[PDB]
């Protein structure tokens, strides 16, 4: 009869496994406490008030013991006579993090060792009618692995040292376990070595047939037709007839097709395939290139006992090509969707929380909506994280955000034993089978940075030169197999129509990593390494830039969420805890970049704002330069979109979903039509018109050279016809040609792109660092008007640069922010909030660059 499934999400409880020293130190954790499933024991402990919130102030240290301990979960559940009657009864674990031993009514059931795998076990003979006891013990991966690791001839190059000294330097357990790399701490997140039943548990019972999957395999898709094949995976316990019926519904919900196929299934695995052709398909396009049209494929399988079982897949029909052809810049790297080369615009996505089990659908959706709102068309889901929730991909499908999907390897050099390899293979098979039917998933990538680290990081170079050359060969072979063969075959076998990429950055093992004329690049000599000036971005142009970034502080409201008024100084212990770059020493690097442009911030609120401006203006330079270089570059994914906790990072959106200056700037430098005017270290300003349209853009552009006093010193305007999908250099001016004896400290230049009379894009250029400028003191008028929300009109008598609007702790949203105001030209922004007009008015704060730098102290001794 009908497949039944019961989710075990009731009365779990957890305690320390008896016999540990932590049981003596934390008696409340030696006693049973309530546990949420899905969950982490860490968040159970926080909920029980056994430890404080590790995000708040410097509390991170107070929960570290939990990741060094072993934990014992239990739940009771009821099984009826009718379930024990069924031909099959299985327990299914969607997610155990990570080393787990599971017993059922006292008897061994399952050993598990991969955060990312699903575990199905025959339970029928171990269950009893009535009450049943399920027990799950989770073992700390640090406690388990270190004793073994300590005895090995070497430790593989890994990730980050423990700031708490509870693993040896450069001997990381994280390398040897399939567990989200970022749990062990990263340079924008806390060390939270979670243990937990972090996804659902079910008791499933079935008889003749179990439906394991529906996959709509896209064989070919173009304007004229899509040929697909609906593939049903059926597990059978006995031989017998089945009938599959298949309804196909179009984007509009109307039936486009209906199909039937009979088959006989045999014990074990069976596949029933139904060929489907759709004429003139309504294809799925990314954001900015058309509709995100999707079809619905509804299958029903009637087994030998007459019972039917439905399964649906929502499909976006589209072709995906990773085009790499030789040209005058080397070898191209371009994402081509439905035959359209898409310049990739976006960022790198990390997990949404240090505790991934508690993330809400709301947060998943607003994170993607943020990306869509900033004119992005791709997110790269970085390999140091975890594979996302099904719902996350659903939303990406709906919004047209392409996903570059790393497998969850974050840079550590993997071991080359067969067991590790086959463990990882099974992970890949399940994740690819789980995610393949999402149209947004357009590329699979073997890892983050393993090859470039092997080739370019000092510790890897020293390591690979220290082992015997034959051992180096064993380790390189293991990597080449895992990332070159294993993952590639999984994608070729299960998700055949999307490309695979061995490593980011790389050339898919054709050659070395991080080249400028082949494959992609992670460019970090700005911010990292030699910490070069941001204008150095103008000198670096790879075929695809898949990481680069600058750091900043989160919103002031977010800062107040984790820090108290006595902590408000980047050098306080609490702010140092929330700065994870360069082992707590990161403020030095942040101040280097802030001071270069803005000198010494005069107070903490100014420091936060200037950190965000330094980041926003710097990434603006780089992103604009990459887009203007087309077809030399074909991708810009900045590091990073988002945060796992409140703290300093390279994000454009902080942990509470609050936009930084960068995200507002990103909406602009990623706009489908854009003007870039970029002044390099040699005083040459290159002007370019960028268009992502699939049609020609008949337009005009203007430049205006201005005194800070509001005198218009020169004006120029040309026509331009901008070809579809291109960038066009329209000028290259020296400071002399632009200024001509005029004071660079007292002069700026405005560049605009127009389509008829509608302003498409604007860039304001300066000829000296902000700290040297004679910026005017702006008087900014603000007028309110009730609308939907409210309309807020701002007008400055003079140039006002990088205006930042806020409202204290009053929660309100703005349609724009971090903008420049030109003399006398009003800007209206939309204000949405639950607060009344009077409150908003009293709460409104308006900040600008001139005011911020006025009264600044000199740069420190």
């Amino acid at each position: 009869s009908h497949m039944t499934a019961v989710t075990l999400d009731g009365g779990w409880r957890v305690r320390l496994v008896p016999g540990q020293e932590q049981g003596k130190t934390y008696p409340k954790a030696a006693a049973w406490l309530p546990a949420q499933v899905p969950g982490a024991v860490q968040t159970d402990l926080i909920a029980a008030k056994i430890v404080p919130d590790p995000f708040y102030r410097d509390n991170e240290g107070k929960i570290q013991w939990a990741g060094l301990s072993d934990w014992q979960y239990q739940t009771r559940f009821t099984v009826d006579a009718a379930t024990l009657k069924r031909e099959h009864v299985e327990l299914v674990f969607d997610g155990l993090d990570t080393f787990a031993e599971v017993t059922l009514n006292g008897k061994q059931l399952l050993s598990a060792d991969n955060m990312f795998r699903q575990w199905r076990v025959d339970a029928k003979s171990l269950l009893k009618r009535g009450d049943n006891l399920l027990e799950v013990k989770l073992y700390s991966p640090i406690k388990k692995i270190q004793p073994w690791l300590a005895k090995q001839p070497y430790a593989l190059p890994g990730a980050y040292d423990s700031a708490f000294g509870d693993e040896p330097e450069a001997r990381h357990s994280s390398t040897y376990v399939r567990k989200a790399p970022y749990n062990f701490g990263w340079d924008w997140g806390p060390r939270m070595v979670n243990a937990g039943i972090w996804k659902d548990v079910r008791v499933e019972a079935w008889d003749a047939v179990r439906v394991d999957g529906l996959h709509i395999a896209q064989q070919r898709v173009d304007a004229h037709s899509a040929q697909v094949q609906a593939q049903l995976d059926l597990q059978a316990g006995r031989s017998g007839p089945v009938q599959v019926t298949l309804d196909v519904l179009g984007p509009d919900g109307q039936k486009v097709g209906q199909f039937t196929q009979d088959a006989v299934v045999d014990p074990g695995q069976n596949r029933v395939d139904l060929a489907v052709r759709i004429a003139n398909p309504k294809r799925w396009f990314p954001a900015g290139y058309g509709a995100q049209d999707r079809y619905t494929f509804v299958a029903s399988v009637r087994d030998a006992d007459g019972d039917s079982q439905q399964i649906k897949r929502v499909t976006g029909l589209r072709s995906v090509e990773l085009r790499r052809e030789k040209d005058r810049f080397g070898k191209s790297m371009e994402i081509v969707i439905n035959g359209i080369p898409i310049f990739a615009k976006g960022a790198n996505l990390i997990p949404l929380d240090a505790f991934p089990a508690r993330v809400t659908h709301e947060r998943m959706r607003s994170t993607l909506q943020d990306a869509r709102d900033a004119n992005m068309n791709m997110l790269r889901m970085w390999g140091g994280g975890h594979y996302q929730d099904d719902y996350f991909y659903d939303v990406a499908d709906e919004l047209g955000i392409m996903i570059w999907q790393d497998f969850m390897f974050g840079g550590a050099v993997p071991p080359y034993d067969v067991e590790f390899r086959e463990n990882t293979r099974q992970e890949a098979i399940e994740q690819v089978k789980r995610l393949r039917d999402h149209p947004s998933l357009v590329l699979w990538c073997g890892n983050n940075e393993v090859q470039t680290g092997w080739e370019n990081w000092g510790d890897r170079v020293k390591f690979k030169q220290s082992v015997d050359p034959e051992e180096r060969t064993r380790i390189e072979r293991g990597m080449t197999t895992l990332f070159g063969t294993v993952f590639r075959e999984v994608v070729a076998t299960y998700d055949s129509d999307v490309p695979y990429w061995a490593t980011s950055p790389g050339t898919d093992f054709d050659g070395a990593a991080d080249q400028t004329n082949d494959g992609d690049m992670h460019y970090w000599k700005v911010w990292g390494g030699p910490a070069l000036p941001v204008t150095e971005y103008l000198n670096v142009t790879p075929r695809f830039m898949s990481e680069y970034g600058l750091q900043s502080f989160p919103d002031m409201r977010t800062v107040r969420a984790f820090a108290e008024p006595g902590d408000m100084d980047p050098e306080s212990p609490v702010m140092r805890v929330h700065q994870k770059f360069d082992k707590g020493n990161g403020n030095k690097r942040l101040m280097l970049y802030i001071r270069r442009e803005f000198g010494e911030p005069k107070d903490f609120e100014s420091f936060v704002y200037l950190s965000q401006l330094m980041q926003a203006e710097g990434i603006n330079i780089a992103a604009s330069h990459l887009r203007a270089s087309r077809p030399q570059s074909m991708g810009s994914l900045y590091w990073q979109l988002n945060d796992v906790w409140p703290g300093a990072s390279w994000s454009s959106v902080d942990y509470y979903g609050r936009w930084k200056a960068l995200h507002y700037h990103a909406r602009r430098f990623y706009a489908p039509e854009m003007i870039a005017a970029l002044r390099n270290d040699k005083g040459q300003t290159e002007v370019s018109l960028v268009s992502d349209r699939t049609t020609p853009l008949t337009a005009r552009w203007r430049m205006r050279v201005m005194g800070m006093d509001g005198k218009v010193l020169s004006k120029r305007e040309e026509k331009a016809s901008v070809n579809a999908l291109s960038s066009q250099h329209v000028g290259n001016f020296s400071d002399k040609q632009l200024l001509g004896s005029a004071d660079p400290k007292r002069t700026y230049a405005v560049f605009e792109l127009l389509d008829g009379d509608t302003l498409l894009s604007r860039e304001v250029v300066f000829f000296a660092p902000a700290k040297q400028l004679a910026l005017p003191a702006a008087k900014i008028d603000s007028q309110w008007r009730a609308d939907g929300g409210y309309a807020l009109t701002l007008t400055s008598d003079t140039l006002a640069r990088e205006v930042w609007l806020s409202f204290g702790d009053v929660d309100a949203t703005l349609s724009d922010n971090a903008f420049d105001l030109l003399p006398g030209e009003p800007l209206t922004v939309r204000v949405t909030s639950k607060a009344a007009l009077a409150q908003l008015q009293s709460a409104l704060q308006v900040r600008d660059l001139a005011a911020t730098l006025a009264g600044a102290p000199p740069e420190p001794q």
Side-chain angles (χ1 to χ4, degrees), residues 17-80:
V17 174
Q20 305 175 83
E21 315 279 356
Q22 289 89 354
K24 289 173 158 69
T25 315
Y26 305 92
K28 292 190 186 69
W32 295 108
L33 57 130
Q36 300 169 322
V37 174
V41 308
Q42 279 79 0
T43 44
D44 293 332
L45 292 167
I46 295 160
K49 302 174 87 73
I50 295 176
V51 299
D53 185 344
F55 287 5
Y56 177 71
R57 298 190 81 243
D58 60 350
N59 285 341
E60 180 191 8
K62 292 173 191 303
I63 201 173
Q64 297 302 308
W65 60 270
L68 305 182
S69 306
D70 306 328
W71 296 93
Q72 185 182 22
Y73 284 81
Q74 290 179 346
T75 186
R76 310 275 286 231
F77 66 106
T78 286
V79 178
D80 56 11

Side-chain angles (χ1 to χ4, degrees), residues 177-217:
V177 51
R178 293 304 303 135
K179 167 170 174 57
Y182 86 118
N183 286 168
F184 291 87
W186 218 264
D187 63 350
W188 34 249
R191 182 166 167 102
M192 291 290 142
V193 183
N194 295 327
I197 303 176
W198 80 290
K199 300 210 153 200
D200 288 358
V201 181
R202 287 174 306 284
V203 185
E204 299 184 354
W206 54 282
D207 292 309
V209 167
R210 186 186 76 221
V211 178
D212 279 335
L214 170 60
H215 169 52
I216 309 312

